[PDB]
Amino acid sequence: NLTAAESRIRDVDMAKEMSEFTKNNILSQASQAMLAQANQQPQNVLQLLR
Amino acid sequence: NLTAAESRIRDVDMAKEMSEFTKNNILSQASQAMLAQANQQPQNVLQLLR
Amino acid sequence: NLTAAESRIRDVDMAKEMSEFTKNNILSQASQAMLAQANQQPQNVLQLLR
Amino acid sequence: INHNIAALNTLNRLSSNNSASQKNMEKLSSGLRINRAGDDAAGLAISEK
Amino acid sequence: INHNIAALNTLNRLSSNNSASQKNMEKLSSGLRINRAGDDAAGLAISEK
Amino acid sequence: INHNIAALNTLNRLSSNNSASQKNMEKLSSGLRINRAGDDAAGLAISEK
Amino acid sequence: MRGQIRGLEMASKNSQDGISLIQTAEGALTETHAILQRVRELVVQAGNTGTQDKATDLQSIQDEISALTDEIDGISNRTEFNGKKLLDGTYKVDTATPANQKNLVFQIGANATQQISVNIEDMGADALGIKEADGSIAALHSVNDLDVTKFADNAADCADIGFDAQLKVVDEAINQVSSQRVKLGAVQNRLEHTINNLSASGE
Amino acid sequence: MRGQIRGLEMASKNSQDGISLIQTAEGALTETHAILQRVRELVVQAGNTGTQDKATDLQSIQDEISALTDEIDGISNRTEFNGKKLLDGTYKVDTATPANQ
Amino acid sequence: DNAADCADIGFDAQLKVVDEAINQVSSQRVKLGAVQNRLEHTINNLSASGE
Amino acid sequence: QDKATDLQSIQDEISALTDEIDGISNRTEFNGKKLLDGTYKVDTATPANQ
């Protein structure tokens, strides 16, 4: 019983934590794409200049 | 922990530094355009002369 | 024991050394991109000329 | 409109998600949600007893 | 009104932004904000220890 | 964000689990939890007597 | 503006480094904790052996335990974060004079008063105490772990030797280090919430 | 005309900056909120432990919680937008005298 | 030696006086900016007057 | 967090920077004229010497 409760404190649910991981890594790639889009506007400011 | 702190001293945020780079290169092109406009007035001084 | 110490002298940590490799190859591609950006300014110097 | 990217929250979201992912792997590799004490001090002290 | 371009600050802004961009790439290629000691002597000495 | 993998604990977890597994097999092949004295010096000295 | 912003960025940097410090400290406390668990095991075994095995086996057990205590103080001494002692009495909770606490003020924000201090205290003598430890009990329960030949004398009767006493004070030492680790975990949480507030503020 | 126009532009500027202020405030309240959620968790656990675990585990729980409260007031004090306290009682809803609000 | 206690060493004291030095140079720059404005309005008045 | 020697490094930097402050206040000249030093102080003891 004690080791079971220990586990319920400590035991990772690798399923949950890998869904969460997959998610978060994808959020990294996501936000990186958002920068890749964000930085594309000032060039059109140059087009305003010329 | 130590290598983490090292990194927080040394580690470039390539995202930040590329937004900054993209910016600054564009500021170069910007100011160059500003010269390309600046140098166009003396010819109209010639038009004053003739 | 002796062969263990030998290993601790000689044994590559392929994990560490592949993280390091992956890193360094990416730094190659990185700096190459930096040249690919660096060489794009003199053309705008031509735009200053004309 | 250019001298400062407005997309600055996006950077801290990037740092957040990267750090998150790091901690995720820390748990996944260790097999412990309580691997470091910063996780849950309460469940830590419990697990100690 | 012509014998000296008034747009002279613009030149030093050009030199500034070019030098800036150079240093940026220096960091981007090295992966070090502290690549040269002129960057941050304090964080340098720290990183040395 | 790249010049040093944040996943460094993961490496020492890898070394830890590998060394662990090694010691496990050491016990499994020998049939002794006390195979080497580093295991349990107390139970060793007992088992000696 | 730029003043507050730059100092803010440095404040978050400062914060992450403070985190790293307390992670080092708590890792030292993780191994501290591991040893104390092992000591507890050895006390349990010691308690059975007090009327099963002999004074020499107990002598072996205390060779182990006393070596482990030497490792406790060894951790409290060797553990350093960029050279700085973390665990020794140098950052004690409460001296006789509160001025001498020398508390671990870290920079937290970008302006005056935006600071937090903490305390750390571990060593060999981490057994019971009212402000300090005490003599035969409450210090040497961790420094000595008395059962050399002394649980061959009695069961728990003496109340300073006695197995109930030894063991409960070991468990309390576990609680001391416990609560300390609990502190630093909370501290880490505080700095995480901090860096969030900082990052949003800086935006 | 030019009076109203220039002051209008400055009014929109003023407005965006007021926005930024309340965004800082609400970010501090986001972390405030996060902590209070965590406190709620600790109270739920505390409620089970009230007849499962002991006074010392509860003591640990309240070491955590009381530390977190210290962080609550820490947020209410440290949170500033260009130096200005935002969360403390200085901008209370209703004093005894409404003049002092 | 201390956190901010000494009030002459103390970190609060050091930092606030640094910030005040920033305010000294600030106000000075503010002066000269105003001065520039004054001379611009001046040269306008002058040019019109001279016309 | 860090030691007296790191602080010593920090103050090597800062004190050097202060030396640069007075260096600016001395070197800065507009057609030879000192601008920043105490020569054009706000208020001496005697207002005549301003």
Residue numbers in the entry:
A (entry chain A), B (entry chain L), C (entry chain B): 255 to 304
D (entry chain A), E (entry chain L), F (entry chain K): 3 to 51
G (entry chain V): 52 to 254
H (entry chain f): 52 to 152
I (entry chain r): 204 to 254
J (entry chain r): 103 to 152
Text taken from the publication that reported this structure:
There are three parts to the flagellar structure: the trans-membrane basal body that functions as the motor, the connecting rod and hook, and the flagellar filament that acts like a helical propeller. Our current understanding of supercoiling in bacterial flagellar filaments, referred to as polymorphic switching, is based upon the notion that protofilaments within the flagellar filament can exist in two discrete states, that differ slightly in length. The “short” state results from a protofilament having a right-handed inclination (the R-state), while the “long” state results from a protofilament having a left-handed inclination (the L-state). To reconstruct filaments at high resolution, all protofilaments must be “locked” into the same state, either L- or R-type, producing straightened filaments that lead to non-motile bacteria.
We also included a previously identified straight filament mutant, HagA233V, in the study. While the three L-type mutants (E115G, S285P, and S17P) have a left-handed 11-start helix, the four R-type mutants (N226Y, A233V, H84R and A39VN133H) have a right-handed 11-start helix, and the designations L and R correspond to the hand of these 11-start helices. The L-type 11-start helices are tilted left by ~ 1.7° and the R-type 11-start helices are tilted right by ~ 3.9°. Another example is the R-type mutant A233V in B. subtilis. A233 is conserved among Gram-positive species but not in Gram-negative species. In the A233V mutant, valine in subunit S0 makes stronger contacts than an alanine residue with the hydrophobic pockets formed by A43, L46 and A47 in subunit S+11, and A233V filaments adopt a right-handed form.
